[PDB]
Amino acid sequence: SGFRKMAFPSGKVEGCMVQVTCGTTTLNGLWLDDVVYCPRHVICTSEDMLNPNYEDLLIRKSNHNFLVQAGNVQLRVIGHSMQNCVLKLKVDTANPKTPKYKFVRIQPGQTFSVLACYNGSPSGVYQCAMRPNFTIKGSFLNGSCGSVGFNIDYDCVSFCYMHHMELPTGVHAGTDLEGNFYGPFVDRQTAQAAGTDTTITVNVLAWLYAAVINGDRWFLNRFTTTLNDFNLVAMKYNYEPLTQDHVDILGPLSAQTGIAVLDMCASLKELLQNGMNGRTILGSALLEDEFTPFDVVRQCSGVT
Amino acid sequence: SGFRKMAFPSGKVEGCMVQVTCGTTTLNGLWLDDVVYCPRHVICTSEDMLNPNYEDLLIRKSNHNFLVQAGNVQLRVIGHSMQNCVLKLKVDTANPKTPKYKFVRIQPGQTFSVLACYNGSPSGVYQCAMRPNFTIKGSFLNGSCGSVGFNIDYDCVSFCYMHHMELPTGVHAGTDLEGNFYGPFVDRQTAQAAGTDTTITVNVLAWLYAAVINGDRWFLNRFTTTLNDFNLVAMKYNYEPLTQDHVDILGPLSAQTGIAVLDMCASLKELLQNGMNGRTILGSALLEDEFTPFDVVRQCSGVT
Numbered sequence: 300s301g302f303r304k305m306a307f308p309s310g311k312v313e314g315c316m317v318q319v320t321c322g323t324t325t326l327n328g329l330w331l332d333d334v335v336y337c338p339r340h341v342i343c344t345s346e347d348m349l350n351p352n353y354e355d356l357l358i359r360k361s362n363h364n365f366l367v368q369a370g371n372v373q374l375r376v377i378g379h380s381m382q383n384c385v386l387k388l389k390v391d392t393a394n395p396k397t398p399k400y401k402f403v404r405i406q407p408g409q410t411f412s413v414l415a416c417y418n419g420s421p422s423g424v425y426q427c428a429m430r431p432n433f434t435i436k437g438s439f440l441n442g443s444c445g446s447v448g449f450n451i452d453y454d455c456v457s458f459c460y461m462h463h464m465e466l467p468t469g470v471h472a473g474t475d476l477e478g479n480f481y482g483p484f485v486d487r488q489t490a491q492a493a494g495t496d497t498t499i500t501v502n503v504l505a506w507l508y509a510a511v512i513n514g515d516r517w518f519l520n521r522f523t524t525t526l527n528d529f530n531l532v533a534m535k536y537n538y539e540p541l542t543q544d545h546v547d548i549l550g551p552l553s554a555q556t557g558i559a560v561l562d563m564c565a566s567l568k569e570l571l572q573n574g575m576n577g578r579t580i581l582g583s584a585l586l587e588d589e590f591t592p593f594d595v596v597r598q599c600s601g602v603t
Numbered sequence: 604s605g606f607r608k609m610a611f612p613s614g615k616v617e618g619c620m621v622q623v624t625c626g627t628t629t630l631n632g633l634w635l636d637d638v639v640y641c642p643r644h645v646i647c648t649s650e651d652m653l654n655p656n657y658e659d660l661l662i663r664k665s666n667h668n669f670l671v672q673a674g675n676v677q678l679r680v681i682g683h684s685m686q687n688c689v690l691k692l693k694v695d696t697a698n699p700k701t702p703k704y705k706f707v708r709i710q711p712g713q714t715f716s717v718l719a720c721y722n723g724s725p726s727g728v729y730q731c732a733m734r735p736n737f738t739i740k741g742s743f744l745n746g747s748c749g750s751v752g753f754n755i756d757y758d759c760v761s762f763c764y765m766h767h768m769e770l771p772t773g774v775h776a777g778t779d780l781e782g783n784f785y786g787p788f789v790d791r792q793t794a795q796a797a798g799t800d801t802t803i804t805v806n807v808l809a810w811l812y813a814a815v816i817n818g819d820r821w822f823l824n825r826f827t828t829t830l831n832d833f834n835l836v837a838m839k840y841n842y843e844p845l846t847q848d849h850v851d852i853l854g855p856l857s858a859q860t861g862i863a864v865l866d867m868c869a870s871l872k873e874l875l876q877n878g879m880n881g882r883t884i885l886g887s888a889l890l891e892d893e894f895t896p897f898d899v900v901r902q903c904s905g906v907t
């Protein structure tokens with residue numbers, strides 16, 4: 300029993316973290332096979348970051364300008380290229396610790412683990428979600444850029460995030476491993492405001508199921524609702540509209556607890572309308588939305 | 604910016620996890636040098652667990668009865684002994700992935716990372732605290748026993764916890780790596796009630812400092828208090844008494860933010876007396892008490 304915000308074990312990703320230095324900017328890179336992936340703003344002077352022309356800035360850089368260090372050993376750079384907002388540095392040595400891996404672009408509402416790194420050294424690991432506004436709520440200081448987000452399916456690491464920037468509101472923007480930003484964000488120091496941070500309804504419902512499975516039940520009521528009725532309440536409280544797709548995904552949690560999805564929706568509706576009246580759910584005083592239905596099943600069934 | 608509940612990177616501990624089977628009970632073991640550490644209840648039949656005599660049960664076990672598997676490779680057991688509530692299985696091979704390590708017994712209020720494992724395979728990593736009642740609030744299903752808690756100081760893993768049992772109230776009890784239980788708990792299926800789960804005051808204050816450092820400031824007020832006055836409020840709300848020792852430990856966070864510890868105490872006093880009036884602090888609607896002053900400094904300064 301017990302339900303915790305849980306990150307994937309980070310060992311497989313720890314083995315991929317390196318330090319990348321171009322001029323006097325040091326950040327993190329991801330070493331997979333004979334390629335090191337890092338944010339392209341590694342080539343910038345803070346001066347450059349107001350309106351950088353990355354193609355023009357990169358022309359001034361040679362393979363020998365990219366200093367790549369895996370622990371205390373230097374990697375020899377034999378090629379470099381820009382793909383969207385990331386640099387691919389070809390090195391002469393395949394990373395012997397390369398796990399089985401994929402590059403995936405996640406949808407908003409999907410969760411992943413971040414391995415926060417500084418100078419190619421891991422500091423810690425925490426669980427995040429791609430917000431509906433395409434930001435993440437991370438923990439990233441200067442030097443953390445090039446830290447990556449990932450999911451693990453048994454033996455295969457799916458990399459989904461590379462950290463690139465902090466908005467003035469203290470939230471985080473980055474790319475997939477093809478260097479495409481999540482949302483409308485650019486690697487430029489400019490006016491970039493996040494949109495509405497809407498709540499991930501399907502995740503809150505997943506987490507209500509997790510609560511019931513672990514003995515927190517005070518919020519179950521005698522009520523039911525419809526998708527259309529519930530969605531009127533979701534609109535009012537800046538919750539994502541719930542779809543039949545979301546209901547279908549909650550099917551297994553429904554089946555295990557014997558609580559119909561629309562009944563749990565009615566519980567969530569009362570919680571939205573009435574708040575928690577100073578009570579808690581799985582040690583939280585707000586509705587948690589960074590567990591997916593897949594996350595709740597995984598943790599509740601002890602998958603490795 | 605941003606502040607997250609952050610676990611240590613788990614790679615160094617992943618390399619130490621094995622599976623231990625005695626008869627038909629499988630749980631996790633910790634392989635360090637040529638010793639595998641595991642809970643002694645691995646020798647029990649669920650029958651035994653009502654009133655087990657571990658010394659008598661162990662006499663029926665031989666080295667060849669302890670099946671120890673590191674991934675898909677079996678370790679040869681050449682010795683076994685009981686130390687308090689753990690078994691030490693001597694194997695013929697030193698773990699080549701043994702990190703630099705220590706065994707430490709933590710005090711209540713200290714935080715650590717758990718690597719949840721099943722059948723010697725890591726499922727995930729989360730951050731815990733030794734509660735003042737000597738329980739932890741974990742995520743542990745059947746098969747998770749022998750999962751370990753740890754801290755990392757640069758290169759040295761300090762193991763502080765091995766998981767042994769769940770109380771009927773859904774909270775967790777275990778041992779240090781010398782096999783001594785935290786608190787009064789025994790490895791017997793009996794009437795074991797946790798005492799008062801008091802709040803770790805010094806940690807809440809550490810986390811209020813972390814909030815100020817990351818721009819959450821609405822809860823700063825015009826007030827101050829004294830240790831004795833604050834402690835009257837802590838008593839009323841089942842908070843640990845704050846000592847000069849705690850004030851001294853908060854010294855660096857005080858110095859960095861320029862908010863005197865007793866002023867932050869007065870903020871905490873108003874929060875206790877008035878609640879958060881539907882507001883949040885670092886994305887929480889309750890007062891977080893599982894960050895130490897050391898944790899806040901580490902995360903706020905990017906230590907690896």
Ligand SMILES: *CC(=O)N1CCN(Cc2ccc(Br)s2)CC1
Pocket residue numbers: 323324326340341342343344345346348439440441442443444445462463464465
């Ligand atoms: C995420 C992170 O580490 N940083 C620091 C770098 N910053 C952009 C810059 C790159 C080169 C220089 Br000089 S400034 C983004 C945030």
Ligand SMILES: *CC(=O)N1CCN(Cc2ccc(Br)s2)CC1
Pocket residue numbers: 627628630644645646647648649650652743744745746747748749766767768769
């Ligand atoms: C923490 C954990 O995995 N478990 C399962 C084992 N249980 C005690 C027992 C050991 C042998 C048998 Br059969 S039952 C404690 C909780």
